[PDB]
């Protein structure tokens, strides 16, 4: 019954804005980072793979290089928050979050970006 919840499954964002999209999971205490994996994708593109307490930047898609963060202090609250800097039409699509923390779950989120 490990469940990920998304406060919003649809974001509509303005061109050039920063955006933070959220996926929540149960955390009451200090994270076991040996066990925690957070994986964000959009449209089969690797945005962030977080494993052993670090973003694996080797596997990150070039479209997200120095444009994406997984907000580490939100993770400590059970919030896998993906921040994209300076959103463009390329960032419109279907995103998916995966959290693994004694069980794994996966949620889809649509992002619509408005014209420049």
């Amino acid at each position, epitope marked *: 019954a490990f469940t990920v919840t998304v406060p919003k499954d649809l974001y509509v964002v303005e061109y050039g804005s920063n955006m933070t999209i959220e996926c929540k999971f149960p955390v009451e205490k200090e994270l076991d980072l040996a066990a925690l*994996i957070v*994986y964000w*994708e959009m*449209e*089969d593109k*690797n945005i*962030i*793979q977080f*494993v052993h307490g670090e973003e*694996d930047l080797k*596997v990150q898609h070039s479209s997200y290089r120095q444009r994406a963060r997984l907000l580490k202090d939100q993770l400590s609250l059970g919030n896998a928050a993906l921040q994209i800097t300076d959103v463009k039409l390329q960032d419109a699509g*279907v995103y*998916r979050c*995966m959290i*693994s923390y004694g069980g*794994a779950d*996966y*949620k*889809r989120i649509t992002v619509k970006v408005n014209a420049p």
Partner: nanobody
Amino acid sequence: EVQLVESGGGLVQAGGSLRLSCAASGRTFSNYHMAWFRQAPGKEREFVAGISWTGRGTYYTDSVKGRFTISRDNAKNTVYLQMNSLKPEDTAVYYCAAEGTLYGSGGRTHQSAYDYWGQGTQVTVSS
């Protein structure tokens, strides 16, 4: 509690066709990348085909491109491999696999990226 069950394997003439099916139970796999792998006796298990959780990205090892087609039916929790133009190289046990927690580290074509595996179905091309 998760089970993947493959069916549809058999003996086929070179040039012929078969359709493999995998029925998943225990949880809904709609949001998971899914794949077929194959393994011949005494050889490394290899990626064959992969389908995205989007439902609309398909990926193939070069030697099966144009011959094999992967598809899924999220209402039935099933994955399919349509195999056409079968060749001697295709003789193997075929496994259907569901995305694992290290998919983002390992990549679509690596065994390490999938945590759930069926028992396999044997395909034999007359050679």
